[PDB]
Amino acid sequence: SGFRKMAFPSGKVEGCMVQVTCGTTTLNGLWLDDVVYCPRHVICTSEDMLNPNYEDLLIRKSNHNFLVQAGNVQLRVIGHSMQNCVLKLKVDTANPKTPKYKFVRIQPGQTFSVLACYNGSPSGVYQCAMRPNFTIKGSFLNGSAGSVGFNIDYDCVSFCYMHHMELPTGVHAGTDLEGNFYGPFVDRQTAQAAGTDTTITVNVLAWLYAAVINGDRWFLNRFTTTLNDFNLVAMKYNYEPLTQDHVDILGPLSAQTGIAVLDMCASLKELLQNGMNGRTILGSALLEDEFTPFDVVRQCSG
Amino acid sequence: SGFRKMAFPSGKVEGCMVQVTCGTTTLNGLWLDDVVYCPRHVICTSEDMLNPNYEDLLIRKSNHNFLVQAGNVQLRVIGHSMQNCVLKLKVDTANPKTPKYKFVRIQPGQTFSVLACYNGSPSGVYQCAMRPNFTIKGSFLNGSAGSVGFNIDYDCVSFCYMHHMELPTGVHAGTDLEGNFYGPFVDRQTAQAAGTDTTITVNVLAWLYAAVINGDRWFLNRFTTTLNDFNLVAMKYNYEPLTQDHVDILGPLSAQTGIAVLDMCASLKELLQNGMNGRTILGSALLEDEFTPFDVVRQCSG
Ligand SMILES: CC(C)(C)[C@H](NC(=O)NC1(CS(=O)(=O)C(C)(C)C)CCCCC1)C(=O)N1C[C@H]2[C@@H]([C@H]1C(=O)N[C@H](C#N)C[C@@H]1CCNC1=O)C2(C)C
Ligand SMILES: CC(C)(C)[C@H](NC(=O)NC1(CS(=O)(=O)C(C)(C)C)CCCCC1)C(=O)N1C[C@H]2[C@@H]([C@H]1C(=O)N[C@H](C#N)C[C@@H]1CCNC1=O)C2(C)C
């Protein structure tokens, strides 16, 4: 038993991380087969960052303007192109440590592990969720762009995120691996702000089930509600509406605990209206929304 | 910016994880050079677990009673011995992926990453602290024994923990890699309980500095206190006494923020006496004590 913010093991991804330098700008790249993927703003200088024309900036470079290192081994750039907001650097050597992989775009509410990197070297791993406003609450310093987010399905690494930049509120924004931003952001230093965030209701319910499984039952009650009555109070507290697909997804957790989904919604409803009043759930004094139903099953069953 | 519960990248350790079976009991082992280390209770059956004599149980086995697999490759056991509460299985092949490593015993308050494993296969990575009562609040299911805790210093993996068992309160107990238990626990199914836990004061102070660094300043004040006056109120709330060595260790964080350690103790003192009163710090509504001063420097500076 127990419950932790658990990341996927990062070994398969650590072998794909490289350093990319162009000019006086160094960041991280992802080396799969014979292509290195990195954020396109590596080709920027400081005078370009307010309003760059990446088309012009790219045509003024040649393959030898890009320094790519895998540890101490240097990689020879033999071609480059831009795909949306990423650069694709064709290199002369295929990464022998290339895992089976795919490129997926995730939806708000889903979670993934982030391998934070500096100068091509993995520094730490942590778990986060894609927020309803398409930002992530990450931990990133200067030079972290090109760090990637991933899930592991069986033996296949699904890459879903590449880090680009930090917003003024301290949250983070990035692209999928095809270079398309999550959210309404662009990689130029203009004033941009995220939309208002909301709480991911289905994730809070999953976490309450994890609590029950681990012996925390004080918030339960005998009542029940309906999807419409619950959704009515949820809007008041900036919680995401709950759909029947969500109820279905919570099925295995309902079964394992013998507590119906709509029973659990009744407990949540009362928690929102009266607070925790000095009690904790799974060691937290706030309702946690960054565990999916699948995260909970994976940790509380295997 | 941002602040996350960040684990070390696990690649170096994933390559050392193997499956060990003896009888109908399968758990994990750690394969370094030509030795596999695993919890000694792998040689137990269910009738032995209440009061095992591991000396007798071990003499009744031969090398062929131990099945050791590294993925699909089988490892040939050519010798075995017991070191305190671990088994050392000599095998015919040296692990080619053996990192530079050392075996260290950690002190209450220090943190480490845990690579949770089942059937020799890495499942997840998370960060935890060794509690003042020598337990850890982990996340472990059946079959997780032999999972290891580690830190990474430069290129060297320091192994500090091997998991053995779960206490009735849902917390976890294990050994260093020489087989010596942390805490007053023994690997037999007798009633044992942990001592009372306390809050790791130096870690709470480090985390308040992380908050200041990330823009959370509402709990600060102009007051100051002394080590003796602070330590007097800390005892009342089950906080660990603060020593001058702790003050020294917090030096770099004092310098970076321009807030003296004893200034920050004055803020903590007032937080303990009046609570947070509906406010959060770094996204938490409780005082967090599982980040060391070094964790904070590593994440908020590099
Ligand atoms: C360094 C800043 C945080 C100030 C910057 N952010 C903005 O310019 N934000 C915004 C404008 S604004 O703030 O309204 C104002 C105009 C400045 C008031 C623009 C982007 C959307 C949101 C608002 C930024 O991150 N930039 C600017 C250049 C790169 C990218 C960068 O350096 N990436 C890092 C690497 N490698 C990773 C970073 C570093 C810290 N932690 C991380 O995640 C870039 C090309 C975006
Ligand atoms: C399965 C139990 C949790 C009930 C068990 N715990 C105790 O027997 N606790 C204690 C007695 S007691 O509870 O007071 C009572 C007498 C039962 C009332 C004894 C140990 C100190 C504290 C109290 C246990 O863990 N055992 C028993 C056999 C192994 C070890 C084991 O199976 N290890 C797992 C593997 N692989 C990893 C586990 C599984 C879940 N998550 C994990 O971490 C073992 C040889 C210790």
XYZ file of C-alpha atoms and ligand atoms in Angstrom:
696
model
C 0.000 0.000 0.000
C 0.878 3.726 0.054
C 0.444 6.333 -2.668
C 3.168 8.471 -4.281
C 3.541 10.786 -7.253
C 5.163 8.103 -9.369
C 6.994 8.663 -12.678
C 7.821 6.115 -15.358
C 11.396 4.758 -15.311
C 13.394 7.012 -17.580
C 16.149 4.701 -18.888
C 14.709 4.355 -22.407
C 14.567 8.139 -22.804
C 17.922 8.993 -21.195
C 19.681 7.322 -24.143
C 18.012 9.665 -26.658
C 18.976 12.975 -25.053
C 21.613 15.101 -26.807
C 22.958 18.624 -26.631
C 22.284 21.027 -29.523
C 24.217 24.279 -29.882
C 23.675 26.924 -32.533
C 25.611 30.116 -31.906
C 25.706 30.963 -28.211
C 22.429 29.083 -27.530
C 22.589 25.539 -26.152
C 19.529 23.397 -25.412
C 18.451 19.756 -25.534
C 17.446 17.562 -28.439
C 15.768 14.181 -28.852
C 17.761 11.741 -31.012
C 15.656 8.993 -32.627
C 17.019 6.898 -35.501
C 18.975 9.447 -37.574
C 16.973 12.589 -36.671
C 17.453 15.015 -33.786
C 14.367 17.010 -32.744
C 14.756 20.268 -30.829
C 12.876 23.553 -30.304
C 13.242 25.857 -33.272
C 14.160 28.854 -31.119
C 17.687 27.445 -30.807
C 18.391 29.384 -34.039
C 17.476 32.666 -32.326
C 19.673 35.446 -30.984
C 18.434 37.953 -28.406
C 17.549 40.609 -30.999
C 15.338 38.055 -32.794
C 13.287 36.829 -29.837
C 10.721 39.638 -29.783
C 9.508 39.057 -33.364
C 11.476 36.323 -35.148
C 10.854 35.240 -38.700
C 12.007 31.644 -38.395
C 11.876 31.168 -42.177
C 14.477 33.900 -42.715
C 16.533 32.819 -39.702
C 16.691 29.225 -40.937
C 17.704 29.993 -44.545
C 20.704 31.953 -43.189
C 22.117 28.790 -41.567
C 24.023 25.802 -42.909
C 24.448 22.311 -41.480
C 27.756 23.291 -39.863
C 26.093 26.027 -37.773
C 24.577 23.258 -35.580
C 26.759 21.536 -32.970
C 25.176 18.243 -31.809
C 26.869 16.193 -29.052
C 25.817 12.846 -27.571
C 27.983 12.990 -24.468
C 31.482 13.388 -25.850
C 30.705 11.908 -29.273
C 29.983 14.595 -31.858
C 27.163 14.041 -34.336
C 27.544 15.286 -37.905
C 24.567 17.315 -39.165
C 23.921 16.485 -42.835
C 20.526 18.172 -43.255
C 17.939 20.296 -41.447
C 14.312 21.288 -41.823
C 11.597 22.989 -39.812
C 8.361 21.245 -38.871
C 6.033 23.767 -37.261
C 7.819 24.802 -34.034
C 10.511 22.094 -33.994
C 13.718 21.625 -35.961
C 14.472 18.227 -37.468
C 18.248 17.760 -37.733
C 19.257 14.873 -39.993
C 22.512 13.383 -38.623
C 24.982 10.885 -40.073
C 24.515 8.246 -37.322
C 21.357 6.414 -36.265
C 20.918 6.321 -32.485
C 21.650 2.667 -31.626
C 19.653 3.079 -28.389
C 16.442 4.094 -30.216
C 13.460 2.497 -28.438
C 10.214 1.483 -30.020
C 8.367 4.799 -29.904
C 5.442 6.810 -31.139
C 4.414 10.468 -31.205
C 1.070 11.105 -29.513
C -0.795 14.270 -28.657
C -2.393 14.104 -25.223
C -5.644 15.722 -23.989
C -6.136 17.980 -20.942
C -6.317 15.834 -17.840
C -3.859 13.162 -18.869
C -0.554 12.720 -17.070
C 2.983 12.067 -18.263
C 6.522 11.895 -16.935
C 9.000 14.670 -17.702
C 12.719 14.032 -18.047
C 14.249 17.406 -17.182
C 17.606 17.925 -18.926
C 20.386 20.523 -19.151
C 23.155 20.494 -21.799
C 21.891 17.140 -23.025
C 22.293 15.569 -19.581
C 19.276 14.157 -17.682
C 18.843 15.912 -14.326
C 15.556 14.638 -12.826
C 12.248 12.930 -13.493
C 8.813 13.989 -12.275
C 5.131 13.429 -13.016
C 2.701 16.146 -14.155
C -0.691 16.612 -15.817
C -1.656 18.623 -18.865
C -3.941 21.317 -17.412
C -7.353 22.210 -18.898
C -5.771 25.492 -20.035
C -2.994 23.572 -21.896
C -0.169 24.546 -19.541
C 1.809 22.262 -17.256
C 3.019 23.064 -13.725
C 6.557 21.874 -14.276
C 9.944 22.610 -12.778
C 12.318 24.052 -15.382
C 15.327 26.417 -15.372
C 17.223 28.165 -18.162
C 18.426 25.681 -20.771
C 15.699 23.093 -20.193
C 13.987 23.517 -23.581
C 13.982 20.257 -25.514
C 13.281 18.246 -22.350
C 10.543 15.734 -23.193
C 7.406 14.305 -21.604
C 6.511 10.679 -22.184
C 4.442 7.701 -21.148
C 5.507 4.067 -21.397
C 2.987 1.565 -22.740
C 4.387 -1.963 -22.401
C 7.752 -1.622 -24.168
C 6.792 1.386 -26.331
C 7.662 4.983 -25.384
C 4.918 7.451 -26.357
C 6.450 10.941 -26.534
C 3.821 13.598 -25.945
C 5.572 16.823 -24.938
C 8.660 18.862 -25.710
C 9.355 21.830 -23.470
C 9.778 25.323 -24.917
C 9.086 28.171 -22.472
C 7.787 29.558 -19.188
C 4.793 31.855 -18.683
C 4.808 34.841 -16.287
C 2.696 32.912 -13.764
C 5.501 30.340 -13.479
C 3.783 27.615 -15.522
C 5.138 26.016 -18.683
C 4.187 25.616 -22.324
C 5.421 23.320 -25.058
C 4.579 21.360 -28.201
C 3.793 17.821 -29.229
C 6.631 16.124 -31.106
C 5.237 17.303 -34.465
C 5.953 20.873 -33.327
C 2.336 21.950 -32.674
C 1.849 23.956 -29.493
C -0.466 22.827 -26.758
C -2.682 25.847 -26.190
C -2.794 29.266 -27.875
C 0.903 30.018 -27.431
C 3.641 31.005 -29.882
C 7.417 30.864 -29.430
C 8.051 34.588 -29.459
C 8.619 36.913 -26.516
C 5.253 38.709 -26.737
C 2.871 39.079 -23.807
C 0.754 35.922 -23.658
C -1.288 34.541 -20.796
C -3.012 31.262 -20.137
C -6.754 30.878 -19.807
C -8.263 30.231 -16.411
C -7.466 26.786 -15.092
C -10.053 24.376 -13.719
C -9.891 21.310 -11.503
C -9.935 17.940 -13.278
C -12.954 16.301 -11.647
C -12.484 12.741 -12.899
C -8.939 12.798 -11.488
C -10.150 13.973 -8.070
C -12.616 11.079 -7.972
C -9.884 8.580 -8.891
C -7.730 9.949 -6.072
C -10.598 9.597 -3.563
C -10.820 5.942 -4.615
C -7.053 5.582 -4.040
C -7.651 6.993 -0.540
C -10.408 4.472 0.209
C -8.170 1.673 -1.062
C -5.452 2.872 1.346
C -7.765 3.097 4.371
C -8.852 6.773 4.366
C -12.660 6.562 4.587
C -13.718 9.484 6.817
C -15.173 11.559 3.953
C -17.574 8.834 2.779
C -21.314 9.004 3.422
C -24.495 7.068 2.689
C -25.938 9.632 0.244
C -26.046 9.559 -3.550
C -26.597 12.155 -6.279
C -27.084 12.246 -10.046
C -24.773 13.409 -12.799
C -26.867 16.555 -13.369
C -27.128 17.500 -9.702
C -23.407 16.915 -9.208
C -22.446 18.803 -12.375
C -24.589 21.705 -11.159
C -22.537 22.224 -7.994
C -19.218 21.436 -9.732
C -19.509 24.474 -12.050
C -19.839 26.695 -8.985
C -16.384 25.636 -7.761
C -14.573 25.692 -11.156
C -14.607 21.903 -11.457
C -14.824 20.273 -14.871
C -18.193 18.701 -15.764
C -18.413 14.938 -15.351
C -19.501 12.825 -18.321
C -20.817 9.294 -18.601
C -17.552 8.306 -20.279
C -15.826 9.390 -17.054
C -18.201 7.284 -14.937
C -17.359 4.299 -17.157
C -13.612 4.948 -16.842
C -13.954 4.868 -13.022
C -15.649 1.448 -13.237
C -12.741 -0.756 -12.108
C -12.221 1.460 -9.055
C -15.929 1.322 -8.177
C -15.749 -2.484 -8.444
C -12.616 -2.898 -6.307
C -14.009 -0.747 -3.478
C -17.718 -1.529 -3.774
C -18.551 2.192 -3.767
C -20.607 3.413 -6.710
C -19.279 6.333 -8.748
C -22.340 8.445 -7.950
C -21.932 7.557 -4.271
C -18.405 8.987 -4.448
C -19.672 12.116 -6.226
C -21.917 12.673 -3.201
C -18.841 12.646 -0.940
C -17.011 15.042 -3.266
C -20.044 17.366 -3.389
C -20.033 17.616 0.398
C -16.239 18.117 0.512
C -16.530 21.082 -1.868
C -19.273 22.683 0.237
C -17.846 22.142 3.750
C -14.096 21.736 3.148
C -11.795 19.267 4.869
C -12.062 21.101 8.219
C -8.546 20.244 9.364
C -8.415 16.676 8.039
C -6.149 15.190 5.395
C -6.654 12.644 2.641
C -3.627 10.544 1.623
C -1.381 13.052 3.361
C -2.828 16.098 1.579
C -5.026 18.900 2.879
C -6.232 19.800 -0.640
C -8.091 17.793 -3.271
C -5.498 16.406 -5.709
C -6.310 16.303 -9.439
C -3.091 15.114 -11.120
C -3.708 11.326 -10.910
C -5.785 9.715 -13.676
C -7.940 6.625 -13.092
C -5.203 4.648 -14.880
C -2.457 6.056 -12.623
C -4.428 4.869 -9.588
C -5.085 1.367 -10.973
C -1.418 1.075 -11.963
C -0.229 1.975 -8.464
C -2.944 0.302 -6.308
C -3.109 -3.026 -8.221
C -0.266 -3.252 -10.750
C 10.918 28.177 -11.901
C 8.378 25.780 -10.333
C 8.918 23.089 -7.714
C 8.192 19.354 -8.050
C 8.916 16.161 -6.149
C 11.796 15.246 -8.424
C 13.524 11.840 -8.588
C 16.926 11.007 -10.033
C 16.913 9.516 -13.555
C 16.775 5.775 -13.101
C 18.558 4.457 -16.219
C 21.750 3.403 -14.409
C 19.746 1.335 -11.919
C 17.242 -0.200 -14.358
C 20.092 -2.214 -15.905
C 20.921 -3.886 -12.571
C 17.449 -5.190 -11.731
C 16.856 -8.951 -11.970
C 14.243 -11.460 -10.909
C 15.092 -14.002 -8.187
C 12.914 -17.059 -7.590
C 13.401 -19.660 -4.885
C 10.518 -22.094 -4.588
C 7.190 -20.357 -5.130
C 8.586 -16.972 -3.975
C 9.699 -14.447 -6.595
C 11.161 -11.027 -5.776
C 13.746 -8.591 -7.125
C 17.517 -8.608 -6.917
C 20.297 -6.108 -7.580
C 22.975 -7.403 -9.976
C 26.367 -5.684 -9.617
C 29.514 -7.194 -11.143
C 29.056 -10.941 -10.530
C 26.893 -10.753 -7.371
C 23.114 -10.541 -7.037
C 21.801 -9.020 -3.789
C 18.260 -9.757 -2.629
C 16.266 -9.945 0.626
C 16.996 -13.125 2.525
C 13.315 -13.914 3.067
C 13.146 -15.189 -0.520
C 14.222 -18.552 0.974
C 11.115 -18.618 3.185
C 7.888 -20.574 2.848
C 4.682 -19.527 4.606
C 5.197 -21.888 7.560
C 8.630 -20.310 8.164
C 7.627 -16.642 8.185
C 6.438 -16.449 11.795
C 9.770 -17.563 13.308
C 12.351 -18.467 10.654
C 15.836 -19.672 11.413
C 17.563 -18.379 8.299
C 20.735 -20.334 9.115
C 18.861 -23.647 8.943
C 16.791 -22.554 5.945
C 19.902 -21.574 3.990
C 21.915 -24.762 4.647
C 19.000 -26.789 3.209
C 19.408 -25.083 -0.190
C 21.828 -25.554 -3.069
C 22.810 -23.187 -5.870
C 20.232 -24.751 -8.200
C 17.349 -23.852 -5.855
C 17.753 -20.194 -6.963
C 16.352 -19.097 -10.336
C 17.872 -15.753 -11.435
C 16.675 -14.099 -14.675
C 17.865 -10.863 -16.291
C 14.946 -10.405 -18.659
C 14.942 -13.598 -20.687
C 18.611 -14.429 -20.085
C 19.064 -16.902 -17.238
C 21.915 -16.372 -14.790
C 23.747 -19.386 -13.380
C 24.122 -19.336 -9.582
C 27.546 -20.727 -8.622
C 27.595 -19.738 -4.938
C 25.512 -18.129 -2.191
C 26.011 -16.620 1.238
C 24.066 -14.595 3.773
C 25.171 -11.148 4.910
C 22.933 -10.019 7.754
C 19.457 -9.703 6.176
C 20.485 -9.968 2.508
C 21.524 -12.894 0.333
C 24.584 -12.546 -1.881
C 24.211 -14.799 -4.936
C 27.464 -15.320 -6.834
C 26.610 -15.749 -10.546
C 28.680 -16.882 -13.525
C 28.344 -13.601 -15.492
C 29.399 -10.087 -14.497
C 26.710 -7.493 -15.226
C 28.152 -5.577 -18.205
C 25.914 -2.603 -17.312
C 27.397 -2.236 -13.798
C 27.723 1.484 -12.986
C 30.280 3.048 -10.733
C 28.567 2.578 -7.376
C 28.924 2.622 -3.635
C 26.950 1.363 -0.640
C 26.045 4.123 1.812
C 23.873 4.186 4.894
C 21.753 7.324 5.087
C 20.567 9.254 8.181
C 16.991 10.248 9.103
C 16.020 13.315 7.124
C 17.884 12.532 3.937
C 16.048 11.799 0.704
C 16.543 9.228 -2.036
C 14.843 7.931 -5.156
C 13.142 4.534 -5.148
C 12.948 2.353 -8.241
C 9.865 0.221 -7.592
C 10.093 -3.163 -9.345
C 8.025 -6.331 -9.814
C 9.405 -9.619 -11.214
C 12.687 -7.879 -11.956
C 10.971 -5.257 -14.119
C 11.101 -1.537 -13.200
C 7.588 -0.138 -12.709
C 7.995 3.440 -11.399
C 10.306 5.945 -9.759
C 9.519 8.262 -6.858
C 11.262 10.371 -4.226
C 10.997 9.809 -0.457
C 12.734 10.667 2.818
C 14.009 8.408 5.565
C 11.772 9.328 8.522
C 13.119 10.087 12.023
C 11.589 6.764 13.110
C 13.542 4.901 10.356
C 10.523 4.083 8.190
C 9.761 5.394 4.720
C 6.331 6.367 3.354
C 6.673 4.455 0.120
C 4.319 2.893 -2.386
C 4.848 -0.870 -2.614
C 2.695 -3.919 -3.459
C 3.284 -7.654 -3.093
C 6.509 -8.709 -4.802
C 8.292 -5.367 -4.460
C 10.972 -6.565 -2.017
C 14.441 -6.075 -3.463
C 13.459 -2.718 -4.985
C 16.268 -0.264 -4.212
C 16.669 3.354 -3.133
C 19.548 5.393 -4.487
C 21.078 8.803 -4.997
C 23.266 9.836 -7.921
C 26.396 11.851 -7.173
C 27.999 12.977 -10.441
C 28.352 9.664 -12.301
C 28.342 7.431 -9.193
C 25.211 5.642 -7.934
C 25.046 5.499 -4.123
C 22.677 2.679 -3.129
C 21.192 3.311 0.295
C 18.044 1.202 0.650
C 16.664 -2.201 -0.243
C 12.986 -2.786 0.426
C 11.823 -5.686 2.595
C 8.382 -5.230 4.182
C 5.350 -3.154 5.124
C 4.234 -2.166 8.627
C 0.584 -2.245 9.778
C 0.355 1.555 9.536
C 1.088 1.298 5.800
C 4.701 2.508 5.996
C 7.759 0.579 4.851
C 10.965 -0.823 6.293
C 14.159 -2.067 4.707
C 17.928 -2.447 4.995
C 21.066 -0.789 3.729
C 22.879 -2.810 1.069
C 24.999 -4.570 3.719
C 21.775 -6.135 5.028
C 21.444 -4.055 8.227
C 17.921 -2.855 8.957
C 17.086 0.792 9.294
C 15.301 0.972 12.631
C 14.484 -1.706 15.221
C 12.843 -4.101 12.772
C 13.455 -7.767 11.954
C 12.340 -9.754 8.906
C 9.919 -12.049 10.679
C 6.139 -11.805 10.870
C 5.964 -10.771 14.544
C 4.072 -7.724 15.783
C 6.392 -4.728 15.437
C 5.555 -1.046 15.384
C 7.475 2.076 14.533
C 8.316 4.780 17.033
C 6.503 8.083 16.878
C 7.454 10.130 13.854
C 8.497 13.774 13.986
C 8.684 16.562 11.430
C 12.111 17.227 9.905
C 12.583 20.902 10.760
C 15.615 21.662 8.594
C 13.709 20.295 5.585
C 10.686 22.505 6.297
C 12.961 25.552 6.386
C 14.572 24.578 3.068
C 11.113 24.253 1.521
C 10.095 27.712 2.803
C 13.194 29.067 1.049
C 12.124 27.270 -2.157
C 8.754 29.032 -1.786
C 10.374 32.461 -1.426
C 12.548 31.732 -4.460
C 9.376 30.897 -6.424
C 7.486 34.033 -5.349
C 5.469 32.838 -2.316
C 6.301 35.429 0.366
C 3.059 35.944 2.330
C 4.267 34.067 5.435
C 7.381 36.222 5.914
C 7.645 38.831 8.662
C 10.117 41.334 10.087
C 10.705 39.454 13.366
C 13.631 37.273 14.410
C 14.210 34.655 17.112
C 17.102 32.641 18.534
C 17.930 28.968 18.224
C 16.895 28.324 21.846
C 13.610 30.214 21.638
C 12.751 28.512 18.353
C 13.751 25.055 19.607
C 11.532 25.640 22.645
C 8.361 26.017 20.572
C 9.399 23.320 18.059
C 9.336 20.565 20.723
C 5.732 21.490 21.495
C 4.676 20.631 17.931
C 6.786 17.441 17.501
C 9.359 19.200 15.327
C 12.985 18.104 15.414
C 15.396 20.442 17.242
C 17.458 22.732 15.033
C 21.247 22.686 15.368
C 23.937 25.118 14.307
C 25.066 22.593 11.699
C 21.574 22.921 10.196
C 21.822 26.728 10.155
C 25.143 26.384 8.313
C 23.652 23.932 5.798
C 20.903 26.484 4.994
C 23.561 29.133 4.268
C 23.408 29.134 0.452
C 19.623 29.529 0.584
C 19.893 32.416 3.060
C 22.401 34.072 0.704
C 20.333 33.635 -2.472
C 17.192 35.108 -0.878
C 18.744 37.615 1.522
C 16.633 36.248 4.389
C 18.565 35.127 7.453
C 17.994 31.601 8.751
C 16.788 32.901 12.117
C 14.472 35.314 10.298
C 12.918 32.306 8.550
C 12.615 30.433 11.859
C 10.505 33.357 13.083
C 8.118 32.834 10.150
C 7.973 29.091 10.832
C 7.323 29.711 14.548
C 4.315 31.858 13.685
C 3.054 29.331 11.099
C 3.083 26.575 13.735
C 1.135 28.725 16.206
C -1.501 30.233 13.874
C -1.653 27.763 10.965
C -1.950 28.629 7.289
C -5.543 29.882 7.705
C -6.679 28.835 4.238
C -3.509 29.764 2.342
C -1.117 27.526 0.443
C 2.643 27.469 0.021
C 4.016 26.052 -3.253
C 0.647 24.442 -3.895
C 0.439 22.719 -0.498
C -1.769 23.439 2.498
C 0.601 21.609 4.883
C 4.245 22.188 5.772
C 6.346 19.823 3.632
C 9.403 18.131 5.172
C 10.670 15.734 2.477
C 12.990 18.160 0.605
C 16.540 18.592 1.934
C 18.499 21.839 1.541
C 20.441 20.076 -1.236
C 17.246 19.027 -3.054
C 16.143 22.672 -3.091
C 19.498 24.017 -4.337
C 19.587 21.306 -7.011
C 16.125 22.223 -8.293
C 16.154 26.044 -7.828
C 19.686 26.680 -9.200
C 21.081 23.517 -10.806
C 12.977 33.273 -19.944
C 11.495 33.676 -19.839
C 10.814 32.811 -18.761
C 11.399 35.155 -19.426
C 10.784 33.400 -21.213
N 9.335 33.490 -21.153
C 8.653 34.361 -21.961
O 9.255 35.133 -22.737
N 7.289 34.312 -21.830
C 6.324 35.019 -22.689
C 6.552 36.556 -22.700
S 6.201 37.451 -21.158
O 6.758 36.664 -20.024
O 4.749 37.787 -21.087
C 7.152 39.056 -21.267
C 6.976 39.641 -22.669
C 8.610 38.669 -21.016
C 6.635 40.005 -20.181
C 6.454 34.557 -24.166
C 6.103 33.081 -24.363
C 4.688 32.772 -23.853
C 4.534 33.185 -22.390
C 4.906 34.661 -22.177
C 11.152 32.079 -21.906
O 10.974 30.987 -21.325
N 11.614 32.127 -23.175
C 11.861 33.345 -23.981
C 12.385 32.834 -25.306
C 12.458 31.325 -25.244
C 12.012 30.884 -23.852
C 13.220 30.265 -23.131
O 14.223 30.927 -22.854
N 13.082 28.964 -22.787
C 13.883 28.375 -21.728
C 14.929 27.505 -22.287
N 15.769 26.836 -22.724
C 13.051 27.628 -20.669
C 12.496 28.572 -19.606
C 13.526 29.409 -18.823
C 12.972 29.457 -17.389
N 12.186 28.231 -17.325
C 11.730 27.818 -18.523
O 10.831 26.996 -18.713
C 11.474 32.001 -26.184
C 11.854 31.963 -27.655
C 9.972 31.955 -25.964
C 2.442 -8.694 3.652
C 2.453 -7.920 4.983
C 2.330 -6.413 4.689
C 1.250 -8.361 5.836
C 3.820 -8.169 5.717
N 4.050 -7.285 6.846
C 4.276 -7.791 8.098
O 4.246 -9.021 8.316
N 4.519 -6.846 9.061
C 4.949 -7.125 10.442
C 3.957 -8.051 11.199
S 2.323 -7.359 11.592
O 1.828 -6.621 10.398
O 2.393 -6.591 12.869
C 1.198 -8.825 11.872
C 1.932 -9.857 12.729
C 0.916 -9.377 10.474
C -0.088 -8.332 12.544
C 6.317 -7.861 10.458
C 7.456 -7.014 9.886
C 7.586 -5.679 10.630
C 6.264 -4.911 10.606
C 5.108 -5.760 11.158
C 5.073 -8.144 4.828
O 5.349 -7.131 4.151
N 5.893 -9.218 4.846
C 5.693 -10.472 5.608
C 6.886 -11.334 5.257
C 7.755 -10.578 4.277
C 7.080 -9.241 3.978
C 6.643 -9.239 2.504
O 5.797 -10.026 2.074
N 7.219 -8.288 1.734
C 6.602 -7.846 0.495
C 7.321 -8.387 -0.669
N 7.872 -8.830 -1.588
C 6.456 -6.317 0.390
C 5.199 -5.813 1.094
C 3.857 -6.401 0.615
C 2.874 -5.220 0.681
N 3.762 -4.075 0.517
C 5.023 -4.306 0.930
O 5.879 -3.449 1.162
C 8.269 -10.879 5.675
C 9.314 -11.980 5.755
C 8.474 -9.796 6.719
